[PDB]
Amino acid sequence: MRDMIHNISYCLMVYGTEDEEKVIEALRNVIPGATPERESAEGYHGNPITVLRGRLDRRRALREFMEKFTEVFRGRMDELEDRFDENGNLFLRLDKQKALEGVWEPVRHGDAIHLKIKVEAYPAKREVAVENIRKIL
Numbered sequence: 699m700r701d702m703i704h705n706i707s708y709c710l711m712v713y714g715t716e717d718e719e720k721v722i723e724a725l726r727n728v729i730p731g732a733t734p735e736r737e738s739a740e741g742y743h744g745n746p747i748t749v750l751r752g753r754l755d756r757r758r759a760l761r762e763f764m765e766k767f768t769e770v771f772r773g774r775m776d777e778l779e780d781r782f783d784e785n786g787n788l789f790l791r792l793d794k795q796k797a798l799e800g801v802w803e804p805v806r807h808g809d810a811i812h813l814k815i816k817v818e819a820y821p822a823k824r825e826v827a828v829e830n831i832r833k834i835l
């Protein structure tokens with residue numbers, strides 16, 4: 699058995715014209731059952747937002763996520779390789795509008811669902827994390 703990932707931190711924003719329920723529906727197409735904490739902040743162009751944040755470590759959610767992550771990113775490792783940090787983490791941003799339609803679309807900038815994925819890796823280093831995910835993909 700492998701843990702694969704230790705936990706997932708997530709962040710996404712709700713702008714003034716957005717329906718928070720649909721934003722959360724989009725998040726739940728990436729992490730079903732996610733129940734984010736709310737906090738008021740400023741987003742793009744200083745627009746007031748609610749930030750929806752969470753740190754998820756529930757085994758059932760992590761495993762379901764890895765199942766979908768694996769289907770999505772099988773043979774697409776070259777799209778992820780540069781998104782790892784020096785500490786084992788994989789940073790993945792997905793298009794929020796696409797998520798609402800049930801599609802995982804990696805993006806680099808813009809309005810996204812931000813995931814900070816703590817990859818099971820020892821030593822907790824970029825190369826180890828990369829190798830581990832590539833093997834999975």
Ligand code: NI
Nearest residue numbers: 741742743744
């Ligand atoms: Ni601007």
